Design a protein around this ligand. Sequence first.
Ligand code: ATP
Length: 269
Amino acid sequence: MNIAELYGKMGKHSWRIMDAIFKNLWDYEYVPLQLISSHARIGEEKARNILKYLSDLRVVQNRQKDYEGSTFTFIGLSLYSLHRLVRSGKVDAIGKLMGEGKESAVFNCYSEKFGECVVKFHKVKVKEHFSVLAIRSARNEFRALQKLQGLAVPKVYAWEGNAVLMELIDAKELYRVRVENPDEVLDMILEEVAKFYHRGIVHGDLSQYNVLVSEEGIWIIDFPQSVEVGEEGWREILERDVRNIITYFSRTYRTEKDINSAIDRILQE
Ligand SMILES: Nc1ncnc2c1ncn2[C@@H]1O[C@H](COP(=O)(O)OP(=O)(O)OP(=O)(O)O)[C@@H](O)[C@H]1O
């Protein structure tokens, strides 16, 4: 069922129940029914009924093991985030899915103010909380993009929940394009990485899947794993972006660039 049809099934009472989940995410995964109810100002039995219906529509997940509590699914938190974008007047209509995998769903959408955009809905210290982590990814991407404005990255328009609204780039992933000047394209990527670094940003997942290319040039996208220069492991993360992109060019084009020199060059600037 499309996100636009799901959006159409939501009434004001539904939105207010979901606001009440969202505002309490910071201190529960499963927000207790009693608090959803007290925040939304909707009676308990009726809140319970709205939630069971939201569950049938896969917007929330309701649990009853320790206590009656509710949290967003991916679809739900995305729907809610879109809602906040629509109410801020930044989006008018959501459009068709452009792609989805492991980390995000990316939709086309149209804005009167910003034109034809994408909205990217994000999914996903002890190494072994879905909503708060997806919203932190979203926000991280948004701030990185903001600090990078003016370079070859999308213009960024807004952030709500797990959603970032940004400019549609008319270009394809590097991986899907055979370039005939690979050395120059590799150098234009490394130069942009140097400009990120001068702005205090490391991309954090640079690859052939998030450099976009056309006749016009390249763009870099996808910044939810980006860190600031000075954060823990930043330098090793920058090295991994440089090594990885250079390795992709070596494998695909037998480009000859030396990894350690490329990094030293970026770092000394
Ligand atoms: N601003 C945009 N303009 C054009 N297409 C985009 C834009 N943002 C995302 N896309 C398309 O959607 C795909 C997935 O988005 P993105 O790479 O940012 O998310 P991801 O979840 O990290 O996936 P990936 O592994 O491909 O990097 C892109 O590789 C690209 O083809």
